[PDB]
Each structure stands twice: as C-alpha cells, then as structure tokens.
Amino acid sequence: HGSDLGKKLLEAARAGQDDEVRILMANGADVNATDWVGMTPLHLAAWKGHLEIVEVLLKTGADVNAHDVFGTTPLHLAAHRGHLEIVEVLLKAGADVNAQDMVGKTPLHLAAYYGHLEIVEVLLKHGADVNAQDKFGKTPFDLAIDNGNEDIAEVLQKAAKLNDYKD
Amino acid sequence: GVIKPDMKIKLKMEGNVNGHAFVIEGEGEGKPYDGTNTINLEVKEGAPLPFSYDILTTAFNRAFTKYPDDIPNYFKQSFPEGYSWERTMTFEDKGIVKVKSDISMEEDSFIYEIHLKGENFPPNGPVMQKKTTGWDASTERMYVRDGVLKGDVKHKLLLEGGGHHRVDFKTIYRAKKAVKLPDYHFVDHRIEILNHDKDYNKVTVYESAVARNSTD
Numbered sequence: 001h002g003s004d005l006g007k008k009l010l011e012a013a014r015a016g017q018d019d020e021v022r023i024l025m026a027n028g029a030d031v032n033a034t035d036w037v038g039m040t041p042l043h044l045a046a047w048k049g050h051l052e053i054v055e056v057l058l059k060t061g062a063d064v065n066a067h068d069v070f071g072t073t074p075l076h077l078a079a080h081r082g083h084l085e086i087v088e089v090l091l092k093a094g095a096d097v098n099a100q101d102m103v104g105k106t107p108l109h110l111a112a113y114y115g116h117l118e119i120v121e122v123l124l125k126h127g128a129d130v131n132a133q134d135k136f137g138k139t140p141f142d143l144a145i146d147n148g149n150e151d152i153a154e155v156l157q158k159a160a161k162l163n164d165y166k167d
Numbered sequence: 168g169v170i171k172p173d174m175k176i177k178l179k180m181e182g183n184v185n186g187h188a189f190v191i192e193g194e195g196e197g198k199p200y201d202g203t204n205t206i207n208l209e210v211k212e213g214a215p216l217p218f219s220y221d222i223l224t225t226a227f228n229r230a231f232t233k234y235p236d237d238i239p240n241y242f243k244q245s246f247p248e249g250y251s252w253e254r255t256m257t258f259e260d261k262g263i264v265k266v267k268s269d270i271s272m273e274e275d276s277f278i279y280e281i282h283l284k285g286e287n288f289p290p291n292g293p294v295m296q297k298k299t300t301g302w303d304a305s306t307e308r309m310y311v312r313d314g315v316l317k318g319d320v321k322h323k324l325l326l327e328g329g330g331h332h333r334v335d336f337k338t339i340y341r342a343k344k345a346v347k348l349p350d351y352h353f354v355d356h357r358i359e360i361l362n363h364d365k366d367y368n369k370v371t372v373y374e375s376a377v378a379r380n381s382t383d
Contacts, residue, residue, distance in 0.1 A: 014341075037253050037267055069265050070181075070282045091358075102183040102284060103190065103212075135188035137211040 002088035006033025013041035013053055021053050031062045038068030046074035046090065049083045058093045065094070071101035075134035079123065082116040087123070097128045104134030112156065114147045120156070130159045168245045170199050170230065175276040176206055180226065182213075184264075184285030189213030193227060195372075199243065202233030202377050205361065208370045215366035218288065219299040221324060222256070224358055224372045226283050229295060229340065232354055232376040240378075241316045242308075244346035247272045254338040258324075262288035269370045298327045307336070309378075316340040318354070354378050363376040 009029040012020035021041070025031060034040055042062040045053040055076075058064060067073055078086040087107075091097060093155040098106050108128040111119040120140070124130060131139055143158065144153035176195035182188065189214035195202025205228050210216060223231045229242040229252075242250060249271045256264040270279045288294045303323040310317050320336035355377050362371040 002215075035253075036255065037265055069284055070183075070267070072282075101181075102282075103181050103188045138192075138212075 002028055002030035003033070006030030009033050010035055010039070010044065012049065013044040013057075014048070016048060016050050016053075018050065018052050018056075018063045022056060022087075025056065025060055029062050031057055031064070034066075036096060037069070038066075040066045040068075040074075042066065043068060043072070043077055046083065046086050046110050047077040047081060049078075049081060049086065051083070051085050051089070054086050055089055057059045058089065064090055065096050065099065067099070067101075069091040071099075072153055073099045073101075073107075074103055075099065075107045076105070076110055079116065080110040080114055082114065082119060084116070084118050084122065087119050088150075091122070091126045097123055097126045098132060100132075101136075104110050104136070106134075106140070108136075108140045108142055112149065112152050113147055115144075115147065116154065117152050117155065118148075122154050124159050130156055130163055168347060169272065170201055170243055171275050172198055174199055174230075174273070175350050176204065176228070176279070177273075178279035178281060178294050180205065180223070180229065180281035180283055182223070182281075182283045182285075184216075184218050184222070184283075185288050185290075187213060191215060191223070191227075192373055193224070193325055196202040197231045199230050199231065201233055201332070203373075203375045204228070204231040205241055205371060205373045206374065210368045212366065214368050216368075217295065217297075218285070219294045219297050220298045220360065220363065220367040220370055221301055222262075222264055222294055223283065224360060224370075225302070225336070225374075226254070226275055227372050228268075228270055228279060229354070229376065230270070230277060231374065232378055235380070238352050238380065239347040239349040241342060241346055243339060245342035245344065248343040249277075250340055250342045252338055252340045253342055255334060256322075257335045257337075258294070259333040260289050260292050262286075262292065262294055265320075291330060293324075293326050297377055300325045300327055301360060302356075302358050303331065305356045307338075307356060308351070309349065310351045314348070315342070316349070320356075351381055352378055353381065 195206030
C-alpha cells in the first residue's frame with residue numbers, strides 16, 4: 001500500500017536515510033505521506049538539510065507547498081534553518097515565496113529572524129514581499145532589528161526603499 | 168555529565184488558539200535529577216491572551232524527571248543532541264491542541280522551540296472564557312512504539328465550579344540519536360502556576376515529575 005510505505009518514507013526522511021528513501025520510493029511509497037502534525041517527507045528533509053532527498057522527493061511528485069498543522073511549509077523550514085541550497089531548489093520547484101504560517105510569518109521573516117543573509121537575498125530575488133507583515137504587524141526588517149542582524153536589516157531597508165519605485 | 172544538577176531553560180512558543188496568534192518567551196531553571204523545574208513566561212506578542220493559560224502550561228521537557236536507576240532514561244540519554252516531542256490534547260468539548268517542541272542544549276541551558284495550535288474550542292466553553300483553575304495531578308504511561316517513546320495521559324482540567332474537563336494527552340518523544348529504550352513505566356506529574364499577573368502576560372510555571380515502574 002502507498003500508505004504503509006509512506007509511513008516508512010516519513011521515518012527514512014526524518015532519519016536521513018537517503019538510500020532507504022530511494023528504495024521506498026522505487027517500491028511505490030506515497031511521497032506525500034503525512035503524520036499527525038502535518039509533516040511530509042519533504043518538510044522533514046528540508047528541516048534536516050537533506051538536499052539530495054529534497055531533490056529526489058521533488059522529482060517524484062512531492063507537494064512543494066504542503067503546509068503542516070502550524071501552517072509551516074518546507075520553504076519556511078529551510079529558511080529557518082539556513083539551508084540555502086534547499087531554499088534554492090524549493091523555489092525552483094514552485095515553492096510559494098510568500099507563504100504565511102499560523103502567526104503570519106513568511107520565509108523571509110524567518111530568514112531575517114534567524115540571521116541567514118544569503119537566504120534573505122535569494123528570497124528577495126525571487127519576489128519575497130519585503131513589507132510582509134506577520135499577525136502582529138511586524139516585517140522581516142522588524143525581526144532582523146529585534147535580533148541584532150543589522151546587515152540583514154540594512155539589506156531589507158534598501159530593498160524596501162527601491163521597491164517604492166515600481167509602476 | 169553534560170546534564171548538570173542545575174540547568175537553565177530558555178524557550179520561545181509561537182501559538183495560535185482559535186485564531187488568536189501569540190508569542191511567549193520564557194526563562195527558567197530546574198534540577199533535572201530531582202524532577203523539578205520552574206519557568207518565568209512573558210507574552211511578547213498577542214497580549215492579552217483571550218483563553219485559559221492552562222492549555223499552554225504543559226508545553227512549557229522530560230529531562231526534568233526523577234528516574235530510578237532501573238528504568239533507562241530516554242530523555243537524559245538523548246543529550247547533548249536532545250530530542251523533540253509532538254503532542255495532541257483532545258478536550259471533552261472537542262477543543263483540540265497540537266503542540267510540537269524541539270529541545271536542544273547550549274552549555275548549561277536547555278533551549279525549547281515550541282509551536283502550539285488550538286482550535287475548535289467552544290467560544291463559550293471554559294477554555295475561551297478562562298474558567299479553568301489548573302491541572303489535576305496526573306500519571307503518564309510511557310511505552311515504546313516504532314523505536315520511539317510514547318506517553319499517554321487521561322488528564323483532568325479543573326474548573327472554577329469544582330468540576331473538571333477530561334483531556335486526553337498523546338505524546339511522541341523522539342531522541343535525536345540512538346539511546347537505550349526503557350520498558351513500559353509511569354511518570355507522575357504535578358504542574359502548577361505559581362504566579363501570574365492579572366492578564367497572565369507574566370506567568371511562572373512549576374512542574375515536578377517522577378518516574379516509577381508499572382508494578383509500584
């Protein structure tokens with residue numbers, strides 16, 4: 001059954017077993033298996049930084065924009081952890097750069113908060129809304145400032161100024 | 168070892184209960200081998216909370232559990248790398264909370280990153296009307312499934328009238344490295360709010376927890 005292997009797939013992705021993952025998928029494992037808190041294999045690989053498994057899962061049909069029960073997407077998780085390469089392949093595979101989680105945070109909010117400058121730059125380059133507000137009215141700039149990530153705060157402030165000059 | 172007799176606690180919770188988003192940060196301390204800890208919590212976003220704080224307090228680390236030496240300690244063995252846990256609390260009037268927490272360690276401090284979602288609480292039930300008084304003492308059954316540790320509690324949430332609201336806890340605890348797995352056993356709990364300001368923007372939580380074998 002797709003389902004019962006799906007559950008082993010979740011475990012293999014969570015443990016980092018690139019080979020297991022590939023074996024399970026070859027035998028029909030449901031790439032979009034979910035657990036009771038809404039994590040998918042792709043979420044787990046994106047959080048753990050298992051780039052090769054992320055790529056494999058995307059190529060075999062994983063939903064790049066699946067949200068867990070907290071509204072978290074794989075792109076949120078890679079951005080939160082600073083997995084630049086995974087952020088790049090997720091965006092190339094169609095990830096919503098401006099997805100909001102249950103407290104209104106976008107991937108750019110998280111990259112700014114957790115101090116991942118290169119991710120900030122990739123996300124803005126892919127159309128991340130620099131003025132996105134979470135549920136408390138905070139921007140990625142506000143979070144950068146609150147955590148002392150001044151270089152990121154400078155990048156965000158400049159992108160916000162420049163953005164005022166569109167049509 | 169890496170877990171000292173005194174350990175500090177730092178945590179953040181991102182939350183959304185019946186659509187109300189909030190952020191809570193805490194700092195605390197406890198004694199892991201005695202099974203006791205206290206945490207001072209402050210609502211940083213989304214103040215004042217429009218629901219019972221009691222649905223949050225058990226989300227605010229089983230490293231703080233007194234374990235006898237004949238039960239392997241799933242939680243303390245997992246460090247320094249740590250462990251994560253996932254929990255569902257099913258309330259009598261169909262309210263549900265889902266909670267996830269990631270527990271790491273930095274020097275002499277545990278660090279918790281918590282996400283908590285509450286939904287389907289009746290707008291006029293005791294959670295959303297803030298008519299709870301606290302949790303009863305409880306006993307969690309710990310048992311191994313799928314190579315990880317599970318905990319079940321048939322809990323009671325005590326209500327201002329003197330009655331109670333049944334709440335079922337299911338938790339999955341996942342060590343980040345291989346550890347010696349215990350047999351079935353119990354963890355007795357007592358959790359208490361030691362202080363709160365009027366709106367519960369500032370709260371201090373206390374918990375004690377002791378493990379014991381199934382026969383006794």
